[PDB]
Scaffold this active site. Structure first.
Site, PDB file in Angstrom:
ATOM      1  N   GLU A  81      -7.918   9.057   2.744  1.00 37.13           N
ATOM      2  CA  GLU A  81      -7.803   7.792   2.011  1.00 37.13           C
ATOM      3  C   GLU A  81      -6.579   7.041   2.466  1.00 37.13           C
ATOM      4  O   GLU A  81      -5.457   7.544   2.323  1.00 37.13           O
ATOM      5  CB  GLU A  81      -7.900   7.931   0.465  1.00 37.13           C
ATOM      6  CG  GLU A  81      -6.943   8.920  -0.198  1.00 37.13           C
ATOM      7  CD  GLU A  81      -6.491   8.588  -1.613  1.00 37.13           C
ATOM      8  OE1 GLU A  81      -7.338   8.598  -2.538  1.00 37.13           O
ATOM      9  OE2 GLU A  81      -5.277   8.337  -1.799  1.00 37.13           O
ATOM     10  N   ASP A  82      -6.843   5.884   3.150  1.00 38.39           N
ATOM     11  CA  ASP A  82      -5.928   4.905   3.768  1.00 38.39           C
ATOM     12  C   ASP A  82      -4.868   5.577   4.639  1.00 38.39           C
ATOM     13  O   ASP A  82      -3.813   5.008   4.891  1.00 38.39           O
ATOM     14  CB  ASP A  82      -5.315   3.958   2.705  1.00 38.39           C
ATOM     15  CG  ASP A  82      -6.158   2.735   2.357  1.00 38.39           C
ATOM     16  OD1 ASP A  82      -6.110   1.731   3.136  1.00 38.39           O
ATOM     17  OD2 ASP A  82      -6.843   2.764   1.289  1.00 38.39           O
TER      18      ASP A  82
END
Ligand SMILES: Nc1nc2c(ncn2[C@@H]2O[C@H](COP(=O)(O)OP(=O)(O)O)[C@@H](OP(=O)(O)NP(=O)(O)O)[C@H]2O)c(=O)[nH]1
Ligand SMILES: Nc1ncnc2c1ncn2[C@@H]1O[C@H](COP(=O)(O)O)[C@@H](O)[C@H]1O
Ligand SMILES: [Mg+2]
Ligand SMILES: [Mg+2]
Ligand SMILES: [Mn+2]
Length: 341
Positions: free
Chosen positions: A74-75
């Site tokens: 995630e990111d």
């Protein structure tokens, strides 16, 4: 670093498996370097604490490793192809699933919907999300009081029951009790202050009772003659389950016998005929009831015979509320292996 805290809990894994988990932690620590949580704490503390929760449950090597890496997508500048290259497809599979399914610290209908859609991949993805959820609830003081209520509800509706269905009762009670704290704090604070002792003191008493019963049963000559073996399990009633039945049934906390309950699961010795086996099945249960009543003082009108009067759900067992340890109401449940579930 924080590794020296995690390493002992990984003793149950083969050396090659532990090296995988270290290689995972070393990768997570490199990936989460310079990142912080809502609490000023470095991000790595979270995946380590999740890996700790899984390691306590003696989870799969790839599962513990996936717990250290569950946020590295995630990111994050980590490609799913790298996780497959380094830790295999199983670690990559779980991690993709835990990332894609609404992550850690973010309608909730779409996040509960995706939870099911990942159910086709493997319940392994969930397990990690349960460990993650438990850790998030443990660190929920760093969350706005609104977001705190969204998580608590979801946990009670989705995750605590899922833990229950996976047979992780110690996860289930903690998930429920932390959810209860943040959902209805007024009820939580009222009930918690009433219960003079902590969960540390509760489990200590239950284990004292278990030792007392186990040693009392093993010392009865006639019982052991008709027995192959026995099992003495305990439970202290948890706040959510204490408050749930007070509202559902109508009883006061003083009117709850279950606040310390103990089960006696017995497997009898083999019998010649099919009938002399069903007769041996019962004779043992009442023989324990006697021994139990000679060990702890029975409370008037508290013997519940479900062997002779089974519940419409087919439930058979003998129940008795007694006065055990430091003058405390203890519930005892006597059943055989067959009468168990
Ligand atoms: N594991 C299990 N246990 C079963 C079942 N049916 C009855 N019982 C036993 O019987 C109990 C329910 O029946 P009872 O004990 O005869 O009722 P009272 O305790 O109200 O006298 C249950 O107690 P509880 O859920 O731990 N307590 P609750 O919060 O509802 O007060 C449990 O001990 C069953 O299907 N599974
Ligand atoms: N007498 C008992 N001894 C040990 N475990 C129990 C006992 N009664 C219930 N349990 C377990 O505790 C759970 C239900 O407890 P509760 O917190 O009262 O709802 C179930 O998973 C049962 O297997
Ligand atoms: Mg009752
Ligand atoms: Mg119960
Ligand atoms: Mn997370």
């Amino acid at each position: 670093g924080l590794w020296n805290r995690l390493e002992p809990a990984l003793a149950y894994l083969a050396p090659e498996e532990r090296a995988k988990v270290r290689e995972a932690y070393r990768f997570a620590e490199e990936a989460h370097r310079g990142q912080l949580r809502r609490s000023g704490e470095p991000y790595i503390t979270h995946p380590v604490a999740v890996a700790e929760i899984l390691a306590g449950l003696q989870m799969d090597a790839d599962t513990v490793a996936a717990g250290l890496l569950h946020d590295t997508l995630e990111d994050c500048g980590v490609a799913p192809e790298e996780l497959e290259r380094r830790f295999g497809p199983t670690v990559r599979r779980i991690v993709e699933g835990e990332t894609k399914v609404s992550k850690l610290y973010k309608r909730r209908a779409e996040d509960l919907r995706q939870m099911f859609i990942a159910m086709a991949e493997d319940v392994r993805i969930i397990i990690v999300k349960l460990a993650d959820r438990l850790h998030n609830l443990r660190t929920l003081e760093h969350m706005p009081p609104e977001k705190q209520k969204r998580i608590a509800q979801e946990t009670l509706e989705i995750y605590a029951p899922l833990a229950h269905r996976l047979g992780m009762g110690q996860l289930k009670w903690e998930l429920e009790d932390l959810s209860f704290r943040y959902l209805h704090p007024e009820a939580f604070a009222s009930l918690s202050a009433r219960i003079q002792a902590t969960q540390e003191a509760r489990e200590r008493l239950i284990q004292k009772a278990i030792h007392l019963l186990q040693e009392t049963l093993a010392r009865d000559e006639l019982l052991q003659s008709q027995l192959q073996g026995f099992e003495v399990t305990g439970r202290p009633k948890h706040l959510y389950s204490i408050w749930k039945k007070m509202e559902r049934e109508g009883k006061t906390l003083e009117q709850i016998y279950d606040l310390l309950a103990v089960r006696v699961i017995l497997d009898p010795k083999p019998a010649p005929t099919r009938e002399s086996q069903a007769l041996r099945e019962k004779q043992v249960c009442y023989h324990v009831l006697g021994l139990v009543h000679a060990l702890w003082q029975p409370i008037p009108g508290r013997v519940k015979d479900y062997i002779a009067v089974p519940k419409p759900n087919g439930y058979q067992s003998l129940h008795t509320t007694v006065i055990a340890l430091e003058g405390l109401p203890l519930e005892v449940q006597i059943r055989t292996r067959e009468m168990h579930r």
